[PDB]
């Protein structure tokens, strides 16, 4: 068998606001007792970079350690689609062995950002539930969140990003809340974030003010 | 072994009256040198063998892969029966293993809603009509849109998603042209699931002043 390598993104949020901090995360699992000593190389785009923080080789309950390399990261770097490859060496496997990774290949596209009302049939029911459709964003990567009067809903739910037929890719977001508080008139609204938006934010609002 | 793979029927396939619901074992990383793979099907560990094994196939990087296909009675899946797939072959180390069968749990009902493009997504030349199924338990659904009884082509369906109530939901965008919306042709959301009166519904939706 032997020692194998995951690499992981960083999650999009980071990678989009303007103080957080994006971190590429390469990690061994599996790694023996008899020769536990494991060593990282970093390249960013071909060329070896020295500012990744290694971390204690974290001993697991079967027999093996686990060791993680976290390379912190430059937002403009990522977005820019730099390619971040982790190279693991192990006294105990024949050729080191290399990860890359890197943002999704192809020209950013710009979310479409519509919230829906409920069904006029769902009224009845106690709980109701709040939509917001993205589609059209290129690549699949973003953030969606609610709220109400400046502070968050915490009961929604978004599916992963689908990938279109026009080659883009869409995505929903359910925010569910008593019905009363759609009864009121308090305005919800749906705050998504992604790279080729203007300042990499919108947000959309909804509330029923009809008749007049 | 190497590795091997169950594969569940297609929700489609085991709520429509006369599909013919198949399990799927995939086997692959077999080797050129000595493959000849072995197959040995369990219901609930008892023994039938109305299951016929793919001749098997083809490679891209020198390495075979092979896989065989049981066909399976629609109630004895929705009735929850556990289903084994075993691969029976030498190679490396000893026989493998693999079960599958149904979600288990208490099949819940699709609530369904069709919503209508906004206000906004009207300044387009193709619009979205939304297809809300929420509520619904297990995960196993199917979803299609038509119009004059005639399919709608121009869709795509969300995965379901685990709900916060331990049920799911899933989203279907339906895309059609804004000049289609206007006209006031109806579009049909159509929704099949086991916990459906008569395993299936369908919304209607259209434009109303
Ligand atoms: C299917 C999936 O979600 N992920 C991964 C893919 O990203 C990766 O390159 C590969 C190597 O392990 O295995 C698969
Ligand atoms: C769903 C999940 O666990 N994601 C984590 C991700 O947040 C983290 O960046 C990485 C660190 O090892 O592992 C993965
Ligand atoms: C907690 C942890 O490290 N889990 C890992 C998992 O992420 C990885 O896919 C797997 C491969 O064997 O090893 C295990
Ligand atoms: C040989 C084996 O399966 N080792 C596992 C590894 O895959 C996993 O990452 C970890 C779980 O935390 O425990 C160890
Ligand atoms: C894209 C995708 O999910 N493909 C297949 C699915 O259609 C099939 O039923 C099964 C193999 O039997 O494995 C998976
Ligand atoms: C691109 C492709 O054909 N991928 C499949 C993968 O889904 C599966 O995990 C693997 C099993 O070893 O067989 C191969
Ligand atoms: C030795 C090996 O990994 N062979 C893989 C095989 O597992 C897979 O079915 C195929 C398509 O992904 O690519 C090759
Ligand atoms: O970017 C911040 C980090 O958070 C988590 C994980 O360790 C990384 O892959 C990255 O997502
Ligand atoms: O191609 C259709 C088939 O796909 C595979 C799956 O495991 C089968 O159950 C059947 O649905
Ligand atoms: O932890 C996430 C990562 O490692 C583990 C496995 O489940 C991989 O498939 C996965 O990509
Ligand atoms: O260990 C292989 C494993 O890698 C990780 C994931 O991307 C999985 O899809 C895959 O099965
Ligand atoms: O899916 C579980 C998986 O998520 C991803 C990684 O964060 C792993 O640490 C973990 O094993
Ligand atoms: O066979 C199932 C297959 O699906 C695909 C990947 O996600 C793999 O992890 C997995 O082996
Ligand atoms: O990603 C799709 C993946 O799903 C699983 C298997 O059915 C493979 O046929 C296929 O590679």
Same mark, same amino acid.
């Given at each position: 068998?032997?020692?194998?390598?995951?690499?992981?993104?960083?999650?999009?949020?980071?990678?989009?606001? /303007? !103080?957080?901090?994006?971190?590429?995360?390469?990690?061994?699992?599996?790694?023996?007792?008899?020769?536990?000593?494991?060593?990282?190389?970093?390249?960013?785009?071909?060329?070896?970079?020295?500012?990744?923080?290694?971390?204690?080789?974290?001993?697991?309950?079967?027999?093996?350690?686990?060791?993680? !390399?976290?390379?912190?990261?430059?937002?403009?770097?990522?977005?820019?689609?730099?390619?971040?490859?982790?190279?693991? !060496?192990?006294?105990?496997?024949?050729?080191? =062995?290399?990860?890359? /990774?890197?943002?999704?290949?192809?020209?950013?596209?710009?979310?479409?950002?519509?919230?829906?009302?409920?069904?006029?049939?769902?009224?009845?029911?106690?709980?109701?539930?709040?939509?917001?459709?993205?589609?059209?964003?290129?690549?699949?990567? =973003?953030?969606?969140?609610?709220?109400?009067?400046?502070?968050?809903?915490?009961?929604?739910?978004?599916?992963?990003?689908?990938?279109?037929?026009?080659?883009?890719?869409?995505?929903?977001?359910?925010?569910?809340?008593?019905?009363?508080?759609?009864?009121?008139?308090?305005?919800?609204?749906?705050?998504?974030?992604?790279?080729?938006?203007?300042?990499?934010?919108?947000?959309?609002?909804?509330?029923?003010?009809?008749?007049?």
């Amino acid at each position: 068998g032997g020692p194998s390598v995951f690499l992981f993104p960083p999650k999009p949020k980071d990678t989009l606001m /303007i !103080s957080r901090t994006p971190e590429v995360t390469c990690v061994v699992v599996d790694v023996s007792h008899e020769d536990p000593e494991v060593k990282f190389n970093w390249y960013v785009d071909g060329v070896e970079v020295h500012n990744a923080k290694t971390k204690p080789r974290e001993e697991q309950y079967n027999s093996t350690y686990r060791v993680v !390399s976290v390379l912190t990261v430059l937002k403009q770097d990522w977005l820019n689609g730099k390619e971040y490859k982790c190279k693991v !060496s192990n006294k105990a496997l024949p050729a080191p =062995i290399e990860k890359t /990774i890197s943002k999704a290949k192809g020209q950013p596209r710009e979310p479409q950002v519509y919230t829906l009302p409920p069904s006029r049939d769902e009224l009845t029911k106690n709980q109701v539930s709040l939509t917001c459709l993205v589609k059209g964003f290129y690549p699949s990567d =973003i953030a969606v969140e609610w709220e109400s009067n400046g502070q968050p809903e915490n009961n929604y739910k978004t599916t992963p990003p689908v990938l279109d037929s026009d080659g883009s890719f869409f995505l929903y977001s359910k925010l569910t809340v008593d019905k009363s508080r759609w009864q009121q008139g308090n305005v919800f609204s749906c705050s998504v974030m992604h790279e080729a938006l203007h300042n990499k934010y919108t947000q959309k609002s909804l509330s029923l003010s009809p008749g007049k």
